[PDB]
Structure formats: C-alpha cells, structure tokens
Design a protein around this ligand. Structure first.
Ligand code: SPL
Ligand code: SPL
Ligand code: SPL
Ligand code: BOG
Ligand code: BOG
Ligand code: BOG
Ligand code: BOG
Ligand code: BOG
Ligand code: BOG
Ligand code: BOG
Ligand code: BOG
Ligand code: BOG
Ligand code: BOG
Ligand code: BGC
Ligand code: BGC
Ligand code: BGC
Ligand code: BGC
Ligand code: BGC
Ligand code: BGC
Ligand code: BGC
Ligand code: BGC
Lengths: 346, 346, 345
C-alpha cells in the first residue's frame, strides 16, 4: 500500500534525502502526470512502455522532462507543483511528439537542441496559462505542450532544411470504407493502442503497460482510461472513419484523457459525473475529428488540443444538480481520495 | 395588446397550466430568441416562415429546439432561462444550418442523429461560455451555435461517407463584376433576404414574415433588423462583392443581428447609440467578409461568428459619454422597455 | 534634457496653448508610441524615417494617426491616453501596412477610404481589448492594429476587384541555402533593417533613424531594440531561413518589440529581467516563423501578432523571485524612470 496512489509516505520520507534522488522522484512524477498521476513507480513503468515502443522517443521524452524541471527551478516556480511532477509532464510530451513528427528518423541527434529549447518554454506557458485559468479555478492540462508543439511544428514545417516535420495534408476525397472487412481483433487492439497514443505510442503492449501504471495508482482512473478509449472507437465508427485510423488508436487518446479527467479526477465521481464523463469523452472524440481536419490544412497535427478544449468546456459547465461537483484544484489528488473529500461535505 | 413584446402576462398565466403546453411555449420562445425576441406568437410566425422556406429545414430546427430544451432540463439548468427560450435558440440554428449545409438534400432522415447529438451540445456550450462572459456581464449570443456548427461541419467535412457537408472553397480568381447589370429591385429584395438568412432562409417572403414576427414584439427591433440588412448591402457594394452574394442576403444577416443587438437591446436606445448600431452593423458586414474568406480555406462557412465577435467587441467598448449606456444583462428585455431603465438612472 | 524621455515639461507647457498645436503633439506622440515612446521629437524623427523609405507609406501612416486620434475624441475616450499618444499608434501601423500590402502600388488614392475606415476601428478595438486585459493589468500592445489589419487584408484578399492585397502563399519546397555565401556585413545591416521593419520599412537608414529616435527618449530602450533585432537574426540562422529574409529584417521586428517591452518598459530592469527579455525575444522570433507559416495558408502576413502574443505570455508569467518585477500599467513610462519606481516601491 506504500506504492499505491499519491505515494504520500514515500515523498515525506524522501524530503530528508539526497537532492539527486529527490530530483529523480520529480522527473518520474513528471512522466506520470501526463495521465494525471503523481507516482514514481507508475512513472518508471511508463518509461518501460516508452522504451518498448521506441527508445529514441523515450530519450527525447526524458530530456524534455528533465530540462523542463530544471527550468521551473531556475524561474522560481512553486516547489509543491514541481515535486508533484506538474512541471515535467508537458515537456515529456513535447520531447516524444517532436520525435514522432520529425521527418529525419530515429537518432537524428540534432533534434535534441529544439527539444531542449521547446521544453524550456513549458513552465512559461504553464504559469501564463495559470494566471488566466486559475481565475475560474481551472487546470492548464496539456495546453503548454499543445501550444509548444503547434508553435514548433509550424515554425519548422515539412520544408525546413534542418528540422523538417512529417508532411500532413487535409482529406481531399471520400475514403472507400468496406464494412465487411471490419475486424473484431483489430478493434480490441485499438483500446490499449488508444491509451498508448496518449504518449504517441502505437504499440498495444505499450498501451497495455500504461494501463498497468494507471491501475497501480488508481483503478478508477484505469477504468475511465479504458472506457474513454472505447467511446473514441465508437465515435470513429459512427462517423465512418477509415478503419486504420481507428486501429492506430487515433480516435481513442483524447477521449481516454477526457474520461479520466471528468470521471473522478477534476469532478468528484458519482453516477452523475460518470455519465458526464461518458458524454465528455464522446464529445472530445468528435472535436478530435474536427481539430484534425482543420489543423491538417496548415500541416499540423491536432495533438491533444481536443482533450484540453473539450474538458475545460465541461469543467466550466455549472449545474443545480448537487451530485455534479467540481473539485477545488488545491484538493485534486486521485478519484478514490477525491470522492471522500466530496462525501464529507456534500 | 397581450401578444406584444415579451408577453409577460401570458407567461404568468401559463405557470399553473399543463406541463406539455408550457413546454410548447418554451420551444416557441426558443425559436424566437434567435432574433432576441421572447414571444411565442413571434415563434409561431417564424416557424411558418421556416415551413414556407423548406419544411425539411423547419423540422431540423424544431427537433434541435426540443432536444436542447430537454437537455437543459436534464442538466438542471436555470429555469428562468429555459422558460424565456434561452436554451432553445442555438439548437434551432444548429438544426437548420446542418440541413442547409448537408450535401445529401431533403428528407435525409439519418441527419436527425447528428442534429440531436449537436443540439445536446448547446446547453453545455452556453453554460461554459456564460461562466466566462458573465464576468464582463456579456451574453453568449449564438456562440454555442457557431461552435457546434463549426465543430460538426469540420469533423465530417465534404468527404465524410455518412454525412458529407456542402463543399466550400476559397476565392481563387478576381470575380468579374458588371456594374451596368446591377438591379435596383434586386438590391431591394436583398434587404428582406438578409433578414431571412438569420435563419439560413433565402426566400424573400420568409424574410418579410420574420420582419413581421419581430414587429409584433418590438417595432424598434424591426427597424434595426431592416437597417442592419441595408448597411450590409452597402458594405458589399463598397468591396465589390459579387451581386449574386448580395442578392442572396449573405452580406446582411450578421449586420442585421448586430444592428438589433446594439440598437436598443443590449445598449439603451439613444441617437448616439443608434449611430453606434450603424457603425457596428457596417463593421460586422466587413468582418463577415473576413471570416468567410478565412474559414473557406478550411471548408467552413462563417455562420454568425461575425455577428457574435463584433457585437461582443462593441459591448466591451467603454465611453465617458453618459448617453452611451450598456444594459445590465439582468435588465435586458426589448428596446422600448430597456429605454425606461435608462431614463430613470442615467 | 528638455527633449529627453517623456518630455513631460513640454507637455505641461503645451496645455495652455492652441488646441491645434496640442493636436499635432498627440499625433506625433502617436507615431512614436509604436515603439512605446511618448515623445514628439522622436515622432518627427520617425516621420522623417518614413519619408526616407516611401512618402506614400508615410502619408497613409499620418492619415491613420489623425483619423484615430479624432475618433478617440469623438468617442469620449480617456484624455490622458489620447495626449500620451496611446490612441494613434495602432492606426499609424494600420495605415503604413495597408499601403505595404496593397497590390496597387504608390499613390493609389482610393486606398485612403479603407485606411480611414480601419483607423476608426482602432479606438474601438483598444477599448474592448482593455476591458479584458486590464483585469490582469496587461496592456493591449498592437492587438488593435493586428486585428484591424488581419480583418482588412482577409476581407479584401488578393482577388478583390477594388482593393487587392499582395499575394501571399505558403512555402511549398525546401529552400536551397548556400552557407558559403553568408555575409557578415549583410547580417550586420539586418540589425537596423529589423528595427525598420517595426514600421514596415526595409531601408537600413530608416531603421538607423528609428534607433536614434528611440535613443533620444531612452538609451535602455535603444539597447534592447538592437539586441532584440540581433536575436531575431540568430533565430533565423538557427532554422536555416533564406538569407534574403534575414537580410530584409523579417526575423527582427517582432523580437525587437518584445525585447524593448520586457527589457525595462513593462518589466522593471534588472539582471534577471534582462535575461528574460533575451529569452522572450528569441521565443518571439520563433513564434514569428510559426505565425507567418500558418497565416500564409489563408493569404495573410503575421503583422506583429507574434510580438503581441509572446510579450503578453511573458508578462503573465509569475515568479517568487523579487528581482523579476512587473510594472503596474499606471506607472509605465520608460526603463530609466520605471527603475526609480521599482527601487522606491
Ligand atoms: C484572457 C486575457 C489574456 C490573453 C493572453 C494571451 C495568451 C497568449 C498565448 C500565446 C501563445 C500562442 C502560441 C500557440 C500556438 C501557435 O504557435 C500556432 C500559430 O497560430 N497555433 C496554431 O496554428 C494551432 C493552434 C490552434 C488551437 C486553438 C487555440 C485556442
Ligand atoms: C478565458 C478562459 C476560458 C478558456 C475555456 C476554453 C473554452 C473551450 C471551448 C472550445 C471548444 C471549441 C469548439 C469550436 C470550434 C472547433 O470545432 C474548431 C477548432 O479548430 N473551429 C474552427 O475550426 C473554426 C473556428 C474559428 C472561429 C474564430 C475563433 C474565435
Ligand atoms: C473574454 C471574453 C471576451 C470576448 C471578446 C471578443 C473579441 C472579438 C474580437 C474579434 C475581432 C476579430 C477580427 C480579427 C481577425 C479576423 O479578421 C480573422 C479571423 O478569421 N483573422 C485571422 O484569421 C487571423 C488572426 C489569428 C490570430 C490568432 C489569435 C490569437
Ligand atoms: C542539447 C545538446 C546535444 C548536442 C548533440 C548534437 C550532436 C550532433 O550529433 C550528430 O547528429 C547527426 C545526425 O544524426 C549524426 O549523423 C552525427 O553522427 C552526430 O555527431
Ligand atoms: C540550434 C542550431 C543547430 C542547427 C543544427 C544544424 C542541423 C544540420 O542538419 C543537417 O541537415 C541536412 C539537410 O539539409 C542533412 O543533409 C544533414 O545530414 C544534417 O546533419
Ligand atoms: C463496439 C464496436 C462494435 C464492434 C463491431 C464488431 C465487428 C467484428 O466483426 C467480426 O470481425 C472478426 C475479426 O476478428 C471476424 O472474424 C468476424 O467474422 C466478424 O463477425
Ligand atoms: C456504431 C455505429 C456504426 C454505424 C453503422 C455502420 C453501418 C453502415 O452501413 C454501410 O453503409 C455504407 C454507406 O456509406 C454502405 O456502403 C455499406 O454497404 C453499409 O453496410
Ligand atoms: C449515430 C450513428 C448513425 C450513423 C448511421 C448513418 C448511416 C448513413 O447511411 C448511409 O449513407 C450513405 C451516404 O450518406 C448512403 O449512400 C446510404 O444509403 C446510407 O446507408
Ligand atoms: C457604396 C459604394 C459603391 C461604389 C461602387 C462604384 C462602382 C463603379 O466603379 C467603376 O465602375 C466601372 C464600371 O462601369 C468600372 O470600369 C471601374 O473599374 C469601377 O471602378
Ligand atoms: C469606398 C468605395 C469606393 C471604391 C473605389 C473603387 C476604385 C476602383 O479602382 C479601379 O479598379 C480597377 C481594377 O479592378 C481598375 O481597372 C481601375 O483602373 C481602378 O481605378
Ligand atoms: C551572428 C553570428 C553569425 C556569424 C556571422 C559571420 C558569418 C559571415 O561570414 C563572413 O562574411 C563576410 C562578409 O562581410 C566575409 O567577408 C567573410 O569571409 C565571412 O567569414
Ligand atoms: C545604425 C545606423 C544604420 C547604418 C546604415 C548603414 C547603411 C548601409 O546601407 C547600404 O549603403 C550602400 C551604399 O550607399 C548601398 O549600396 C546598400 O544597398 C545599402 O545596404
Ligand atoms: C545560431 C546557429 C547557427 C547555425 C548555423 C548552421 C551551420 C550551417 O551548416 C551547414 O549545414 C548544411 C546542411 O544543411 C551543410 O550541407 C553545410 O556543409 C553546413 O555548412
Ligand atoms: O545509442 C547511440 C547510437 O544508437 C544507434 O542505434 C544509432 O544508429 C547511432 O546513430 C547512435 O550513435
Ligand atoms: O477491401 C474489400 C476486399 O476485402 C476482401 O475480404 C474481399 O474478399 C475482397 O473481394 C474485397 O475487395
Ligand atoms: O451507483 C451505480 C448505480 O447508481 C444508480 O443510481 C443507477 O440507477 C444505476 O444504474 C447505477 O448502476
Ligand atoms: O414527411 C414528408 C415526406 O415528404 C416526401 O417528399 C419525402 O420523400 C418523404 O420521405 C417524407 O416522409
Ligand atoms: O434518406 C433517408 C433514409 O433514412 C432512413 O432512416 C430511412 O429508413 C430510409 O427510408 C431513408 O432512405
Ligand atoms: O440620478 C441620475 C444620476 O445617475 C448617475 O449614475 C449619473 O452619473 C449622474 O450624473 C446622474 O445625475
Ligand atoms: O504626390 C502625389 C503625386 O506624386 C507625383 O509625383 C505623381 O506624378 C502623381 O502620380 C502622384 O499622384
Ligand atoms: O489612383 C486612382 C486615383 O485617381 C485619381 O485621379 C483620383 O483623383 C483619385 O481619387 C483616385 O483614387
């Protein structure tokens, strides 16, 4: 039970100890914060998943986390945020997806320059976005990652002579979809691939491993991760998306994140907020189609912009239903503990 | 008499009456709230106009209004707002323009699935936008409609195999405009067609009906709806827009809305405030051009985004002219009643 | 010293004097407010710069400045802001860049109609944007200009029969860049050309004049203008931009504005804050490429949107370091005097 949730005991114990280990704690908590987890073991496990996918991306992820963390220290950011990993997770993503969307292949070592540079912007985006969003008691989610990646990918683009990005072009014809070819086996693989694509990973073992890491911290988060991935799959089929897009988990990652967020993490989990999480996840998946189409016209991927905009929208919803309750940000940990706080004062 | 303005007395009467009839009334107010009117008779007249245009569009509007009203109830939204029609007007438009912008033409029954889905969205957009805009005492206008429409039409796009939208492409050459051919009687028809296009109707008779539906509530609103359409035409000629576009009322619907909003509804009506409505109306017509061009690159229509942004812009204007007064949201009804509050304390 | 900084002695003296001479003053201070300077001599110097570049662009600038200042008066806007020149600078840019981005060339007199119209929007954009941004004590910078320009240029486009804009298309192939041809002298000349490009002037003399106009008001502002422009050049090189783009100052004008803003104008000037301006200026140049690439898709230029977004982004940054201090809007003048307030608060 010491390796579960928050790992609040371990961190209080670490407070006494060498700073380099304390730092490694933060980097690991930073990696896990992508899926709203603050748990170093979960972090190590996720690293394994990233290494199984592609050690090059894993490395670019780690450089990101470390560089961003150093930068928050440099700029005197809130230390409680840094120890929770809140200053590492955006750049984890920036490092990984900068490598995914690079046209130069694995171990193009120069990539480490712009990865380090874009990772330094992550605490600047976070603080600035917090100055606005904390006024409505909202989180910044991965807006810093998504701004950083959109900025970097459009600044370079596919024709940059140093750091060309992969070419992305809008849909320009009706895809032929032959429904008798739809495959149960591939759809089932799509569920964990959807969770894997939260870190831009299409290996179903990696998504399997990520589900494992979440389970360790909070089974309620694990459940909503899987359900959101499923609802994304359903949304894709409902709009007749090419099957291979659904198979590659492209319909599932934004949905999965949205479902975790609303399903107990930033809303207290009741039956009502569980239904709300199902709605948000479907909504998020459709916004993903929308953002993908539109950002393809300017040669950009959607990233997790859909998850960010969808979820902020649902958190801004007010209701006279007392069973739908927004967590105070200063109180957000994980669903099982969140629900206790809510039950105490309802 | 009792069928004028806001029908306060009929509203007070209905409160004891059957649930089903009160619901009919919320829906009809929902319909009229597109033009800032809360009047069930105006609602009936507008509905007649929609049936004169295209009964398919009328049906989708009505479904939209009903689903949204029901979703606001399901989500325990504010009753005053529901009864006033404020939870139906966005989805009225969502239904109509999803039909207007469908490439599958009339009585494509499948369209009822995404219309309902997107109508369920409108209370969530309204509530989230309120949480932000109410902090400046601003209304959401048709931002929920325009967000839903934009999301829907880019998520599907012209190449969706299930729900293709109408193809929209950017301007790629100088249009040839033959000035001698300009028809005076055609510009005169453009005025009521501009008003018809508020509900995506290009039939001049339907335009006049809407003008009449508005008249019944408020003559001042009617006058500004007409002036706004006119100014749009003038802006269109000033930029050498193709005649066919002016004639189909595409330069007049946003203008018309902006003019009504500023000309007595959201600003107290004075002559200074009347001049401000004219300026806003012109500015809106021009922002319409801008948004149309830019959104066309991604295959989207402007919708009423230009009305929403311009009017919000003009409502955030501050002045040390005491005759330019912004109405408290809580005191906004229609220009004749608004004006009494201004005379009392300004 | 009477023609230094804010020229607040002259301003007080002018108060008693004929309304029209005062007006010329506000107009001249409108011109210099593009670079956050409130100084009529600076404004005249900058005006001379514009004439050196292209008198037709100079004319459209002044017309914009006048129409906007008049519109601010008409709409009963704050007098304080009008006499400081905060109601003329956005339309100065509006006018200049509407001429630069017109496909019709010099002395196309009809251009004066939409220049005037778009200049009247500038006080409206300013007031509306203030109503939002003043809640975080943020200034509007040149968002009114950039909104008005983006609206105008996209409402017309390259294929408007009356007012075609210049055709802008996105990059569609890898540029060929010959590194042995790189010229130190041209790169050195790009520094003042970058400052020139703040008012859309590619003439290195003009940009040299602009640096002089700034220096007259504030040497610290002049220094950061030069530094901001330089870091723009480094950014361009770091992404292998075509040399001619670097040479024409296209990587330096956003950078330069950001570096002046953060380097003592909107942030108190310190060690840390200087470093922060270097960081902001680099970031801003990268955002310039991003915004130019993306906006070219819809046929629009970046204007100074990058400067506006980056600088607002860095002023929304909070820190537990007391040497990184944000100036209250009501106390902002120029670095030299801003620093006094800082040491005294
Ligand atoms: C409220 C008052 C305070 C105002 C403060 C302003 C905040 C400043 C943020 C500036 C950072 C912008 C950089 C992000 C993305 C861009 O790089 C690109 C270029 O347009 N985006 C893209 O082309 C794609 C991104 C589209 C996603 C939608 C954005 C909502
Ligand atoms: C101040 C703090 C509040 C922050 C809260 C965030 C609010 C969340 C709402 C976001 C939902 C967006 C859905 C709307 C439109 C999209 O489908 C796409 C986005 O590319 N629109 C388009 O493709 C075109 C849209 C262009 C319209 C002009 C832009 C205003
Ligand atoms: C907090 C609530 C207050 C709400 C206030 C509403 C403010 C309304 C402002 C709307 C005026 C827009 C005019 C400017 C640019 C447009 O012409 C077009 C949009 O398609 N430009 C472009 O497409 C290019 C512009 C892109 C720049 C990126 C924006 C960060
Ligand atoms: C953040 C600083 C990290 C600097 C590492 C960059 C070193 C350059 O690395 C180079 O990358 C090329 C591309 O794959 C290889 O072909 C070369 O062999 C390699 O030396
Ligand atoms: C931050 C500044 C560092 C810039 C690093 C320069 C990267 C050079 O990258 C080079 O790009 C060429 C394509 O044009 C390839 O042919 C070379 O193999 C590759 O090394
Ligand atoms: C929840 C989403 C709906 C699931 C649709 C299931 C359609 C699967 O279809 C099945 O695919 C198998 C491939 O493994 C084939 O062997 C079967 O013949 C076929 O019936
Ligand atoms: C979970 C939602 C699943 C949506 C139902 C998918 C079944 C669609 O049905 C398909 O329609 C196509 C027309 O585009 C035809 O070409 C196919 O033959 C037909 O089977
Ligand atoms: C909620 C999910 C509902 C999706 C089902 C919609 C199926 C679309 O229906 C199909 O549309 C095709 C083109 O639009 C037509 O060619 C076919 O006749 C029709 O089967
Ligand atoms: C509201 C203001 C509208 C101004 C429209 C004026 C249009 C006439 O203007 C002129 O018309 C000629 C055609 O006879 C063309 O040859 C010219 O190119 C055109 O400038
Ligand atoms: C405020 C509205 C007035 C509009 C002014 C219209 C000016 C038209 O200008 C005309 O444009 C044509 C190009 O299409 C050219 O053939 C003409 O030479 C040119 O004078
Ligand atoms: C900003 C720092 C980048 C390095 C700039 C120097 C690179 C230019 O290169 C220099 O250009 C000169 C032209 O004036 C030539 O005479 C020199 O031979 C050449 O070395
Ligand atoms: C900081 C003050 C700015 C210095 C400006 C340097 C002006 C160099 O300007 C140069 O002058 C040459 C001869 O006149 C011309 O042939 C070149 O085209 C021009 O670039
Ligand atoms: C501020 C950082 C400046 C970066 C300078 C880039 C150094 C140019 O590096 C160039 O890379 C080319 C690949 O495109 C090679 O073909 C050339 O031989 C090499 O000179
Ligand atoms: O780990 C370091 C090495 O990994 C290899 O797979 C790459 O091909 C080499 O370029 C690199 O130096
Ligand atoms: O893509 C559809 C294809 O799938 C196969 O399973 C069928 O037997 C082919 O005849 C068909 O063309
Ligand atoms: O607590 C979970 C349960 O809550 C009840 O209120 C619902 O009616 C059930 O459908 C649900 O399974
Ligand atoms: O309800 C109206 C009817 O109109 C007809 O023209 C359509 O073809 C039918 O499908 C529809 O039921
Ligand atoms: O065109 C719409 C289609 O919708 C379906 O719901 C109906 O069953 C079909 O008869 C019709 O062809
Ligand atoms: O009683 C009417 C009063 O209302 C105030 O809010 C105004 O600013 C006063 O000048 C005016 O006399
Ligand atoms: O200053 C305005 C005038 O400048 C002259 O030198 C040109 O010949 C004219 O075409 C222009 O209208
Ligand atoms: O450049 C076109 C210009 O021609 C002149 O002869 C007219 O007097 C100007 O108003 C007109 O705009």
């Amino acid at each position: 039970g010491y390796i579960t949730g928050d790992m609040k005991e371990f961190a209080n114990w670490l407070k006494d100890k060498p700073q380099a280990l304390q730092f490694v704690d933060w980097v690991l908590r930073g990696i896990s914060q992508v899926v709203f987890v603050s748990n170093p073991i979960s972090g190590i496990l996720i690293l394994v998943g990233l290494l199984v996918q592609n050690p090059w991306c894993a490395l670019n992820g780690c450089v990101g986390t470390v560089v961003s963390t150093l930068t928050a220290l440099l700029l005197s950011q809130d230390r409680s945020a840094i120890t929770a990993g809140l200053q590492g997770y955006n750049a984890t993503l920036v490092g990984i997806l900068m490598a995914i969307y690079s046209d130069k292949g694995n171990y193009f070592w120069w990539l480490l320059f712009p990865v380090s540079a874009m990772s330094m912007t992550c605490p600047v985006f976070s603080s600035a976005l917090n100055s606005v969003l904390s006024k409505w008691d909202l989180p910044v989610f991965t807006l810093p990652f998504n701004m950083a990646l959109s900025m970097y990918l459009s600044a370079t683009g596919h024709y940059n002579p140093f750091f060309p990005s992969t070419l992305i072009t809008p849909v320009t014809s009706v895809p032929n979809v032959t429904w008798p070819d739809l495959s149960a086996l591939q759809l089932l693989k799509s569920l964990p691939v959807g969770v894997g694509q939260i870190y831009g990973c299409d290996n179903p073992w990696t998504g399997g491993i990520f589900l494992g890491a979440i389970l360790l911290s909070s089974p309620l988060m694990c459940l909503h991760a899987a359900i959101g991935s499923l609802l994304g799959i359903i949304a894709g089929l409902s709009l007749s998306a090419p099957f291979e897009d659904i198979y590659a988990g492209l319909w599932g990652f934004n949905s999965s994140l949205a479902c975790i967020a609303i399903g107990g993490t930033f809303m207290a989990l009741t039956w009502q907020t569980h239904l709300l999480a199902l709605a948000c996840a479907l909504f998020t998946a459709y916004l993903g189609a929308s953002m993908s189409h539109v950002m393809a016209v300017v040669g950009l991927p959607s990233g997790t912009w859909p998850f960010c905009l969808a979820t902020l929208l649902f958190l801004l919803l007010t209701t006279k239903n007392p069973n739908i309750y927004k967590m105070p940000i200063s109180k957000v940990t994980y669903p099982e503990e969140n629900r206790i706080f809510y039950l105490q004062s309802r």
